[PDB]
From Swiss-Prot, chains A, B, C, D, E, F:
Keywords: Capsid protein, Outer capsid protein, T=13 icosahedral capsid protein, Virion
GO cellular component: T=13 icosahedral viral capsid; viral outer capsid
Ribonucleoprotein as UniProt keyword: no
Organism: Pseudomonas phage phi6
Protein name in the entry: Major outer capsid protein
Phylogenetic classification of the source organism: Viruses, Riboviria, Orthornavirae, Duplornaviricota, Vidaverviricetes
From Swiss-Prot, chain G:
Role description: P1 is the major inner capsid (core) protein of the polyhedral procapsid, which is responsible for genomic replication and transcription. Forms a dodecahedral shell from 60 asymmetric dimers. Binds to RNA and may be involved in genomic packaging.
Keyword entries, A-Z: Capsid protein, Inner capsid protein, RNA-binding, T=2 icosahedral capsid protein, Transcription, Viral nucleoprotein, Virion
Gene Ontology MF terms: identical protein binding; RNA binding
GO cellular component terms attached to this protein's record: T=2 icosahedral viral capsid; viral inner capsid; viral nucleocapsid
Keyword Transcription: yes
Native organism: Pseudomonas phage phi6
Protein's recorded name: Major inner protein P1
Pfam families, per database record: P1 (PF20837)
InterPro entries listed in its UniProt record: P1
Subunit-level organization: Homodimer. Associates with the polymerase complex.
Taxonomic path: Viruses, Riboviria, Orthornavirae, Duplornaviricota, Vidaverviricetes
Name of the gene: P1
Subcellular location: Virion
Amino acid sequence: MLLPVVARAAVPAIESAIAATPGLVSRIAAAIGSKVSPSAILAAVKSNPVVAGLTLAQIGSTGYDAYQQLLENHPEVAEMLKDLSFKADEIQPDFIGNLGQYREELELVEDAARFVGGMSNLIRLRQALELDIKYYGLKMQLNDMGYR
Amino acid sequence: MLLPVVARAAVPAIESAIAATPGLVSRIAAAIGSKVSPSAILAAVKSNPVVAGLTLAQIGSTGYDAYQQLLENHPEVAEMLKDLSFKADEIQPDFIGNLGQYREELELVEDAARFVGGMSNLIRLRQALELDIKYYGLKMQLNDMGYR
Amino acid sequence: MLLPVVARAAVPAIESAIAATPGLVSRIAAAIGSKVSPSAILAAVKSNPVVAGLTLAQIGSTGYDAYQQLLENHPEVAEMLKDLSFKADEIQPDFIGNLGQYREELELVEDAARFVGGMSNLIRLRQALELDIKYYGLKMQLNDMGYR
Amino acid sequence: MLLPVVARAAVPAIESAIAATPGLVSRIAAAIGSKVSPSAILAAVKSNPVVAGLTLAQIGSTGYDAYQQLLENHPEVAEMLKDLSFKADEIQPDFIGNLGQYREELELVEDAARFVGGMSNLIRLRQALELDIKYYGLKMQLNDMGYR
Amino acid sequence: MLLPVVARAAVPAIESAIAATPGLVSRIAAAIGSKVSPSAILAAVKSNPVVAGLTLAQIGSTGYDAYQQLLENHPEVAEMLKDLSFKADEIQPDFIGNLGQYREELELVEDAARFVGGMSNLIRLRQALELDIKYYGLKMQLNDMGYR
Amino acid sequence: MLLPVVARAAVPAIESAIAATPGLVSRIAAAIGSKVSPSAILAAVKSNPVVAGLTLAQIGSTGYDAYQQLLENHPEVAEMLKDLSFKADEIQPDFIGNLGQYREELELVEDAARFVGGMSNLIRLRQALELDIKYYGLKMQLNDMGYR
Amino acid sequence: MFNLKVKDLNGSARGLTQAFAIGELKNQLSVGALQLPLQFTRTFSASMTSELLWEVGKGNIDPVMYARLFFQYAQAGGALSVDELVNQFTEYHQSTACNPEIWRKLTAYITGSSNRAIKADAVGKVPPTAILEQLRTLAPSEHELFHHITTDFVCHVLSPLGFILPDAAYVYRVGRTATYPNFYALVDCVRASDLRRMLTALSSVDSKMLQATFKAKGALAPALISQHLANAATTAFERSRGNFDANAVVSSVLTILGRLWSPSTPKELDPSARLRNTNGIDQLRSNLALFIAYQDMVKQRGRAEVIFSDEELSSTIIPWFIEAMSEVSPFKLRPINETTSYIGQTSAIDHMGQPSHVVVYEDWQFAKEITAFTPVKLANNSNQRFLDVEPGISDRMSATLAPIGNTFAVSAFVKNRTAVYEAVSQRGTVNSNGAEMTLGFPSVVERDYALDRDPMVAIAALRTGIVDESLEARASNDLKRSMFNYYAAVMHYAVAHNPEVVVSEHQGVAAEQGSLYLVWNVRTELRIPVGYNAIEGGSIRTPEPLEAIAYNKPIQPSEVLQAKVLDLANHTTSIHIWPWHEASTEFAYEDAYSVTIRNKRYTAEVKEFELLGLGQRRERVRILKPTVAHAIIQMWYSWFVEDDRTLAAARRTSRDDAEKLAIDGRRMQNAVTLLRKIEMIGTTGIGASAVHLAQSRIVDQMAGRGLIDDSSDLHVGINRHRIRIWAGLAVLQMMGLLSRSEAEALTKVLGDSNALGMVVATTDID
């Protein structure tokens, strides 16, 4: 059913949100599809972990903490829960065409990348050149003193 | 008897509920079937875990915490506890017939399920189609850049 | 000597009760049989665990917590302490004869018990029959849909 | 030198007692034989555990907690510390002669003890006889119903 | 995905900083390159750890705690994150030449070092000589008493 | 670098001391030899543990806690840190000669010690003799009753 | 697959830790503080056998096995214990035997003649189930298992005379035996010594004399039978009477051992100079299986008491307790080295010495047989139903499964694992943690399938130590009884390879008056400890049986562990009364092989009844589950995806050229050994007939559209290497062996590594 380790934190978290405002109680009753009465949904939470998760998605303010802790002790629901809760991210009309212009550009980076090494290196090497000149002098001088 | 670990936390929870209102004291005395005096039931709680559980069912407000922790302390009382505490869930007159109409429908899902895979997959695949078109364009474009 | 883990909690617990009212100080001095002075008994508590227990029996209000924790770290005294502290439970004049009438009755349950199984089963089976009829219909219908 | 686990609790405990009243600072300086300055003794506490203990004996009010925790992590000092801190318990003039009268009496108990069993048994058996009569009736009746 | 153990602490930490002042929201939106809306960046943090780090660099006041804990559970990002977040340390005009004068000097220490031993030794030996004379007398006297 | 377990506690501890008074900021900048700016030293603390220690020596008020915890997770620096931070203890002019008089005396104790046993024994035996006489009577009497 | 962090043992696996066994739920367990030296040279191991169908109806009595039926009926049946059972048996046996009528009334029925002699010719035949029907009314009981034992008693004395029909038959399944005694399994096996002396009296009645006097004289009254039975049944009633409580035989004799092991036993109660010298304690002193039993004893009772006379009486208890166990029983003493023989160990070593990962696995002999039965009711609303074995379905699969067998042997899995940790690990020490210890126990997952239980509650039983209550008691009773085997099976292993063991006494929290725990002396020759202990002296003393494993060198299992299938074939007629729907899997399958030929999609469906040669789809038949076969494959799947996961986890962070090429060197080399294995399954009898058909549904679907034929120089081969692979899953899918999910991920792994791409690359010359 529901892990006590989770449930310990979970139940009062939900109950707190309910006591905060009634407007959420009707919402979760709609999403989970449970009897609108606050006692009902609280009976459902204990029964199924999948249900417990959807509730904590409906209230993210105070509830985010327990949700993560629920996710820990239950890797099982993690896949299923991820699917049931989903929203299509609104895409910008310009986006896909706007990306089309960078085709020329990214292929240029990856030519520079392969040469240098991993992308991490090139980000470094870029800084080394952009770096102030004095530093090249500094390093030369430490080698002048016989430090390596 | 009663294990001490349960006692440090469990004893004050009940005592608090008693001090809150007298009306519960008479109730638990009836359910557990113990002498109405608050000192009596408190002597019984320590003695048997099964008894301790029924008390915590009578008061769920403050008491729910210890109850769960009692589940961990004694496997046996909880096992014989689930039976002693039971209430017939009131059934709606419409329900069983109302379910009869979905016979046609669920058999349709399970035809679609088996084809795709586990129910988890079909919930995903359903979203993939319902998903906005631009995304299909987006993914095609990343493959155009040689990313995949 | 008294173990520190206990003593840490024990000593201030007793001292608090003393500071609450003097009337207890005379009582514990009588029961433990120690010098009436509050400094004396507090010197005795540290010395012997058995003594420490009897004190915590005399004051159960604030003291019950430490007592249990004393009981944990000392299973040794547990037997001895249980004996030294005892009170004959007042028996009701009606009781033993009142029990005589149930001889006929309990032997009836145990005939029903053995048949069914453990007492736990019979408590269940009793509910199954007492249960509303619709449920028998419900379960039949799920089997009609091919669910096991 | 002093283990941190102790020192963490120990140092502020002492420092608190110092800040409470100056009168203790002069006392501990005398007992430990350290420079009267509060900074000095605090430098000594960190240096030697044996010294740390004697300080916590001088102040028992707030300090008793750390002392026990010091005693845990250092079983070594436990012997030495017990010796350095000692006070002859004032004996009552009547006591030793007053004990002489019980010679006749205790030898009587130990004759009764050996017969019964361990002292724990005799304390029980004594109660069984002192116990009210009805109980003997009660137990006989349960055997009448065929319970054992 | 971001590990929960981190995310638990991370999310409210960021959200707190946002609620503190709006001026940061625009900054992080610029650095991470995300939609200016506070809900957007909070959606990004959960998605990528690398992103989560850059945010916590932008706010160091309240956020430093989680950042380190992020760094623990993710040694992977540690390299990449270190590169993306970088600032050229302003160098003083005098510095490199000012260092040139110590060439003569440091070579003198390392002549003394090798002779004595590790640098740690020489720091000690230097103190031993600088030390007051009486101490040499003190140590001689303990040897006079036959102490070693 | 500095281990997080330490750093978690260390960083805010230092930052708190800085916010308390500016006068320390200039001091630590002198001792560690770092840029006077509070942001600079805080950048140094994270970088090297040895540096982190010297800072916590400069502020002992609030900082002593973390320092010890730093010492735990880093036994390495423990040697090096002990050397870099040192102060010659001012010696009293009278001391060494004042010790010369006890030569005669201590050699007397060690003659008594060897005879008895370890020094711990002699401290006990000394008390046994100093102890009141009645006790010798008491013990004799318990043996008279046949107790050992 | 079960992973534990050996550094923190308490948290990761509390089931196998010793701290749990003696009652410490809290973290603390005493160090090597106080000690006494000891050597365990013997143990009680159950004989190596698993459940078999045995039939109760026929006239024989085989006392050992009826005894075994009581174990199962009472214990796993949900009832309290076999002890309470047997007691209610001898109140039942006293009822009939000591009662003069009940032996007349049912000899009036079987002989037919109340008041007069019966001739020699006129002897009718009464079927065994008959007399049972009436004995039910005469001597009623709540346990049918008693009536069967009396019924086939009278059948045994009357068999020579021929008053009863032989033909009728009937059958039950005896249960599986725990390899090591739980505390109660001692108490049981002591009562079952009584019982076995009971039945050996009933069983041995010849009634040859009654057969002789019947022949010569020509006739005999019921007065001769009905006495001659009553003489037998009261010889058995003698032998029951006056045996000691098992509960107090053992409770004592595990205490008075427990006092001569523990070093700290107060002198106030010391086992005396005589009983210490008793014949037989010497041997029982050095025995292990008792010890871990003792640890259990105190775990529950919390205490102990010696009721029996500390001297005169307790020296006739032991010689009686020895004779109970020592005699042939399920438990037979063996030298300790042998009972752990099948466990084996291998480790992944750093450069210095110490473990990085160390694996412990149970070797297996894969079971190559399978049977398929069809259930047949006797009458509507009657549960008697008896199955018919059908050959020709089973001959297919067992000739299909036999090729699978050779190639999955367990040793080849770990021999593969350590080859992973060679490649993935950096060059540097492991100080960061104790070396994690992975342990394959195919027996665990195996027991989950025959009992139909979520693998997640089984594992999580070992981790936290407590059993979930949500499940019904039939599982928990076989779950805990299981979880105790592994605990025991661990310590027999640890002790076998570290003969030096030392017995302390735990009293830190003062939970019980008497307690015991071993501490091992193992000499590590390592610089840094794994787990946590001071590693001082060039030997480490570790209370945990797991840690004391980790310091072992590699061990090769000397004895294959043997699963064996339940056997339906032998007795066909007998009616099955045991539920067989637990061990039966439904058998049905559907699948579609899709290929794309010249820019279209062609899908060949296929059904299981076609694969088997059956022309029609028959619903009834049910494959009897291939558990141990599904156990192994389940293991080999989880270790495969685990490997292939851990590499692609390092492969990202490698940051080396020399090493990175060694990872992709591994994956590819792994995945194409994966595939050459599945292709090897495709040539099998089901694999064949799956292929022959799939190509044929694809052909006739292309009839309409004329398109050009292939080269098949390599194309016949390329197409061939692909279609086989899909047979390889189809055969695994249709039998239980591989679940549909994991079959998909196993395609995806073989999919992205482009294994097939590399397989063909060896069939061309350039």
